[PDB]
């Protein structure tokens, strides 16, 4: 809402953009404090009672530091390799062998 009023006012341009930074830094400062994996998997998707709903909603609003934080990146990486799990730390030669085998 603040980031859309910034494009409609254009004279109080810097003030709404100064308030949107507080609205983003609150979320990043909450994200920092989580310790167990249950707290991370309670923040990144909402109340259930995958499906990464808050992350897919933070793409639309472009909150870059909420997605570029390590506590979200490790949760995305454990989905990006969700059955391979030994290729997660290998050389680029082993990765090129994979794409050559699949392309063949």
């Amino acid at each position: 809402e603040l980031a859309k009023l910034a494009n409609i006012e254009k004279e109080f341009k810097n003030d709404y953009r100064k308030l949107s930074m507080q609205c983003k830094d609150f979320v990043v400062g909450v994200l920092d404090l989580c310790r167990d994996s249950e707290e991370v998997e309670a923040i990144l998707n909402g109340d259930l009672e995958a499906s990464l709903s808050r992350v897919k909603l933070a793409i639309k609003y472009e909150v870059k530091k909420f997605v570029a934080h390590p506590n979200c990146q490790q949760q995305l990486l454990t989905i990006w390799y969700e059955n391979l799990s030994g290729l997660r730390e290998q050389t680029i030669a082993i990765k090129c062998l994979v794409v050559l085998v699949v392309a063949l």
């Binding site: 167990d36 994996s37 490790q74 949760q75 454990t78």
Partner: protein, 210 residues
């Protein structure tokens, strides 16, 4: 407001540092539980150590049953206090066990309230031992006291050791394991630990940087 009036007359005299008003109520020895809950859920020792009252702390440890001497210890190492830490380590029930060495989560089955703060969770992360917390805050006097008692940080294993203990902690909660490794290396890579833990420290600093 579950507490009685003797509870308030005890708690406020503890949190203000009245040596006679607390000495008289422990000497009266009538209708008083040393455990209590005030506001957030303060203890006797948690209140008495949060502002540096050594004379009260020498008296509260005279009784046998205090259930929260672990969070007074972490709160005292988190601050600069040294003589309070000497008093807490001088306690007999704390000393004659592997309590220095064990993490609160890995300390036992851990149903006791020994490292417990309030009711929700331990003050800090459950992986943090006292010697690691001393090395984070860089208190050179506390590290020497804890190293004389016999607590040394254990080096974490290699990235893919594949030992039974490492796999079991990896199959459940990968994230807390990866966080605990960084807490251990933040403990080891500090000038407090490096200077007072081993002989020839410049070589182990050059080696740990690798």
């Amino acid at each position: 407001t579950s507490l009685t009036a003797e509870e308030e007359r005890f708690l406020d005299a503890a949190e203000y540092g009245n040596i006679p008003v607390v000495r008289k109520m422990l000497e009266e020895s009538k209708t008083l539980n040393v455990n209590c809950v005030d506001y957030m859920g303060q203890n006797a020792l948690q209140l008495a150590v949060g502002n540096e009252h050594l004379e009260v702390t020498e008296l509260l440890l005279k009784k046998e049953n205090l259930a929260r001497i672990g969070d007074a210890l972490l709160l005292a190492i988190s601050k600069g206090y040294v003589r309070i830490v000497e008093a807490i380590l001088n306690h007999p029930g704390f000393a004659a066990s592997k309590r220095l060495t064990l993490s609160p989560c890995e300390q036992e089955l851990q149903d006791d309230d020994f490292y417990a703060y309030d009711e929700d969770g331990t003050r800090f992360s459950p992986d943090i031992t006292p010697i690691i917390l001393a090395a984070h805050c860089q208190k050179y006097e506390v590290v020497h006291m804890l190293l004389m008692k016999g607590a040394r940080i254990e080096r974490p294993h290699d990235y893919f050791c594949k030992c039974g203990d490492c796999m079991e902690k990896q199959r459940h909660d990968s994230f807390s394991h990866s966080r605990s490794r960084i807490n251990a290396y933040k403990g080891l890579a500090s000038p407090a630990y490096l200077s007072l833990s081993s002989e020839d420290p410049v070589l182990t600093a050059l080696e740990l940087s690798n």
